[PDB]
Amino acid sequence: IHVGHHTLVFELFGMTFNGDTILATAVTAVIVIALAFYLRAKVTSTGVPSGVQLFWEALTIQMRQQIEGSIGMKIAPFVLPLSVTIFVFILISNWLAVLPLQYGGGAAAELYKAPASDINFVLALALFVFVCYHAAGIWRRGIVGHPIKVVKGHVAFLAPINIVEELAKPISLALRLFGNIFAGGILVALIAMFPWYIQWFPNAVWKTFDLFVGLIQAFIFSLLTILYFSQSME
Amino acid sequence: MSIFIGQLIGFAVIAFIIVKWVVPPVRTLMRNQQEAVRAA
Amino acid sequence: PNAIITAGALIGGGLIMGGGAIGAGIGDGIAGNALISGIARQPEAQGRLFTPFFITVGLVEAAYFINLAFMALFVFATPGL
Amino acid sequence: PNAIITAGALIGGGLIMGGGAIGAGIGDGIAGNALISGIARQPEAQGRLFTPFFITVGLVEAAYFINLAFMALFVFATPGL
Amino acid sequence: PNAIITAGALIGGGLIMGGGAIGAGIGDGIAGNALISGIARQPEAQGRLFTPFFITVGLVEAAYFINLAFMALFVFATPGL
Amino acid sequence: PNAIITAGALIGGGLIMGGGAIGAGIGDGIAGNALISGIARQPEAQGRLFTPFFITVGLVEAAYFINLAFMALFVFATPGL
Amino acid sequence: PNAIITAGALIGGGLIMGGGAIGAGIGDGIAGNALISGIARQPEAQGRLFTPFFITVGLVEAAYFINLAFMALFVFATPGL
Amino acid sequence: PNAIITAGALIGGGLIMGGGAIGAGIGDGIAGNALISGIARQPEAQGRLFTPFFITVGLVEAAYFINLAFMALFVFATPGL
Amino acid sequence: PNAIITAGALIGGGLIMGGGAIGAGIGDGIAGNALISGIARQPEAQGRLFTPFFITVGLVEAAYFINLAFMALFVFATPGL
Amino acid sequence: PNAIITAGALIGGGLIMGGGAIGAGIGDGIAGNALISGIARQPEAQGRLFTPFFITVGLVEAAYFINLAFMALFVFATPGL
Amino acid sequence: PNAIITAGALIGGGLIMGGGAIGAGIGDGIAGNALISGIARQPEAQGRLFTPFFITVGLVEAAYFINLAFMALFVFATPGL
Amino acid sequence: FLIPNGTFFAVLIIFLIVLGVISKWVVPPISKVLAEREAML
């Protein structure tokens, strides 16, 4: 099925970059930036909200409710922007794959492959969240206090387990997002092996459900980010 | 060529499904929210 | 020699996905059973039950999809070959 | 060489489908047990109970589908062939 | 060569039936447990309790059937043979 | 020769019976758990509960028989022989 | 040639009894859970709980017994040997 | 030839013990869960509860024992040797 | 000859311990679930609940122990070698 | 000879990851079922229930990734290679 | 000769950790379900419920540890090399 | 394909930009709108 082989690969600063993944991430970023700018231009406190205003309001309200119910908004004002940007980034990345941006070589190529299908994207998001809430814990507990609480956790005599669970927080949070989207990239490829007259059915059903799967994955990734922040700050 | 046609038929099916069964509810929700906002 | 390694990798990946599917299906079924029971007892609780639900699902799915990823490593980029 | 890889792929696909069937069947049974119990408790909640149900069924049946795809990769498109 | 492929296909079909039987039996048992408990708690619910049941069974019987199909492909139409 | 095919068929049929036994035993034990709980909570309903019970046991024990119909096919007929 | 078939038959019989024992143990445990809980909750109905119990066990113990029989057929009267 | 049969018999006996251990452990746990709950809610009922419990544990530990026997027959008195 | 028997014995002992660990872990989990539920509901029952629990655990761990012993017999005193 | 080593290591790592997936998924599903039910009954208990929950999941996940840590050691280090 | 022995050792250790992972994960999930349910139903009981819990998880996680230890013996000190 | 690459940074940078924009173009304006919404009722 020809897994891997990122296209547009180049080399700079003595390291290799997957061009296609960067292009997909840039496309998602520009879509999110366009949504943000269209909100900013058309954000009304007194008027009737636009569609983008309603979308952003619902997302922000959901994340703010999560923060309120897990760790006070006073303690964690900086985590709401993180949750909102994470959710929109992953949601748009996954949903842009629903567009028919794939063709035949004679293997199947795809103009836009979901960036989460690449290990670098999901690993970058997971490690950024990891560093972010570990820094938040350090700030709220101290440079030396925070590691002690992290190792101790809620049960002291389970110290190694915590040290594993902690290292499991990013890894899973990355791979859980990776395999879910990576797997999809294979199915669409696998379904491409069918002839056109029967390819549309499995492809149609798979991508119709992949809309919901990507929505749920973005929601889960953001929710677990908020939960890890609430855990690591107190 | 054939892959593109098959996937395009599939995407037409997806668009029809979302427009017929997914778009209506999330349109109401939006209209209800706007109505509530203009109410206050 | 490569044929034996390839067959072993295929069997190992099949085991990985079999275990991942068993765990995913059963754990998701149990979590959704809790969700449906809660929404049956308190139909107005649905909104508040999707947070602890998708958390649980988020955990369960991990055990699956991590495994899925590694099967690819087993299958398409076999560690030994 | 091809025979060994094909046999290993058949065994791996059999594992994939066995695990997928176990997970899907047991998860569907558990979710439908919740649905039946809820509709016994609250018949008027029947419709309200079909939202968390199809989501749960959506989560397991997704995994199953993925499994069914990967077996199709093992059996008809043996990656290490 | 074909002997190895046939043996692997037979083992894979055995695995497919094993998983399908486990999933079907256990899921049907769980759904029937829900149905029996619901009917025991109240008789008049029986009429409604058969709609969620046959749905759940339909999900649990589909998976088995799918497995039932694929073994028929594995043994009678062994791919890669 | 086909001795390898026969060994593979025996292993496959063993898997079929193992999975069928697991599924039948566990599923009909769950159904019987429901039946016993219903009779204990309402001893006058015994006969009533035997309608849904034998339905689910009909589904659970059917899966077994079908598997029993295929292990026999595997070891006595061995379609790929 | 007979050694390979004999080893395959031994593995198949091991699978048969492994599945049979798993099913028997778990199903008997579930049915006994029902019986013990019902006797605790409704001690006076102890007799009425034994008809639905020995039935369920009768099913479970049947599934085991059949498997055991076939295991014998696998090991002592290995088909295709 | 005897080496192949011995290895197959060892694998089959290991399968028998794995299945017997799984079934025995899980069924004993389920029956003991019933007993513990009944004795928690009915402190003076434990006596009566020990009647069905030992019956259940009778059907569970029995299966294990039978498995424990046949594994010996597989390992020390290998039928096929 | 010796190598094949040793590898088969290692696989059989691995199966023995895998099944034993599955049974022990799940049975201990279920028995401790009953114990925790009883102690949560009935504080003063904590003393009375440890007698059934220790019985249940006694029946579970024993199985594990037995498996462990046999696994040693498989790997340190491989019969038929 | 290294081909057999790699095939065996891949199958063993696949078994490790499959067992880890099954255990982690099902245990996380059970713990999250408890969490969702407790939140449905008492929403205010949400924050209270995440303390024990993430202890239990903390153990369950530790069972998964530790196994994963060993699977790497099987496939990338392959002791005895 | 040694190649087959250590390949079988790898598969057996994989089985050991697969069973240990399944048992540990599911038993810890069940004990955690009990602990979470007890804390949700009796908020003030949390401090108490950790003694029955860690006993349960003590017996569960013990088994896993043993399995892990034995895998080392299987993997790094494989018997009968 | 599981080995990270330079794209890692190339992704992180981009994400940071979004994290910046949503940190000021989106989240504070939306919080202000919701606060005004609460105030007016």
Ligand SMILES: COc1cc([C@](O)(CCN(C)C)[C@@H](c2cc3cc(Br)ccc3nc2OC)c2cc(OC)nc(OC)c2OC)cc(OC)n1
């Ligand atoms: C004989 O009937 C079937 C049914 C299927 C399913 O997989 C369900 C099987 N299961 C219940 C065990 C099924 C399915 C797929 C889903 C995918 C995602 Br992602 C999320 C939820 C899903 N839910 C699903 O059913 C609720 C499915 C697959 C498919 O593939 C081209 N086309 C479908 O037509 C829309 C389709 O619906 C009927 C497959 C199949 O092939 C062997 N035969």
Ligand SMILES: COc1cc([C@](O)(CCN(C)C)[C@@H](c2cc3cc(Br)ccc3nc2OC)c2cc(OC)nc(OC)c2OC)cc(OC)n1
């Ligand atoms: C003893 O008789 C049977 C029955 C079957 C079933 O599979 C059920 C087996 N089970 C109870 C373990 C059965 C079936 C299929 C379903 C498929 C979907 Br998708 C959803 C629900 C289903 N429910 C089903 O029964 C409730 C079935 C399969 C089939 O295959 C060509 N033809 C059928 O005739 C319409 C048929 O109905 C009788 C198979 C079989 O084969 C040996 N023998």
Ligand SMILES: COc1cc([C@](O)(CCN(C)C)[C@@H](c2cc3cc(Br)ccc3nc2OC)c2cc(OC)nc(OC)c2OC)cc(OC)n1
């Ligand atoms: C050491 O004792 C035993 C017991 C058995 C059983 O299978 C029980 C197995 N279980 C505990 C898992 C047992 C049995 C069989 C049943 C069959 C049907 Br259909 C329905 C109900 C049954 N209930 C059963 O026990 C209540 C059995 C089998 C048999 O085989 C010729 N002869 C029996 O008559 C003496 C007999 O006891 C009635 C087998 C065995 O073999 C080594 N050794």
Ligand SMILES: COc1cc([C@](O)(CCN(C)C)[C@@H](c2cc3cc(Br)ccc3nc2OC)c2cc(OC)nc(OC)c2OC)cc(OC)n1
């Ligand atoms: C001990 O004796 C048995 C019994 C069986 C059964 O399979 C049940 C086994 N189980 C309890 C583990 C059984 C059966 C079949 C069913 C099929 C469908 Br579809 C739906 C429900 C069924 N329910 C069933 O019993 C509840 C059966 C099968 C059969 O086939 C040759 N002939 C039968 O009549 C002579 C027969 O008894 C009605 C098999 C067997 O194998 C040697 N030995």
Ligand SMILES: COc1cc([C@](O)(CCN(C)C)[C@@H](c2cc3cc(Br)ccc3nc2OC)c2cc(OC)nc(OC)c2OC)cc(OC)n1
């Ligand atoms: C304690 O050490 C043991 C115990 C056993 C048991 O199997 C229990 C196994 N379990 C703990 C997993 C046990 C047993 C057998 C039963 C058989 C039937 Br049928 C029905 C109920 C049974 N209940 C049983 O205990 C509840 C048993 C078997 C046996 O055979 C040689 N001799 C025994 O007397 C010394 C004996 O103890 C009464 C086996 C064994 O083998 C190494 N070592």
Ligand SMILES: COc1cc([C@](O)(CCN(C)C)[C@@H](c2cc3cc(Br)ccc3nc2OC)c2cc(OC)nc(OC)c2OC)cc(OC)n1
């Ligand atoms: C990096 O973290 C770990 C933890 C373990 C454990 O096995 C638990 C694994 N599980 C949660 C899946 C763990 C353990 C052992 C127990 C033994 C008995 Br008897 C009874 C209860 C136990 N409970 C345990 O944790 C609840 C353990 C092992 C060990 O090895 C020398 N040293 C320990 O103390 C320093 C130790 O305790 C923390 C293993 C491991 O290996 C990679 N890595």
Ligand SMILES: COc1cc([C@](O)(CCN(C)C)[C@@H](c2cc3cc(Br)ccc3nc2OC)c2cc(OC)nc(OC)c2OC)cc(OC)n1
């Ligand atoms: C903690 O480290 C251990 C523990 C064991 C146990 O098996 C329990 C393991 N389990 C919890 C998974 C344990 C045991 C055995 C039992 C046997 C029967 Br029959 C009935 C109940 C039992 N309950 C038991 O503990 C509840 C045991 C075995 C044994 O054999 C050499 N010596 C013991 O004394 C020192 C002993 O107690 C500590 C074994 C072991 O070896 C690797 N390491």
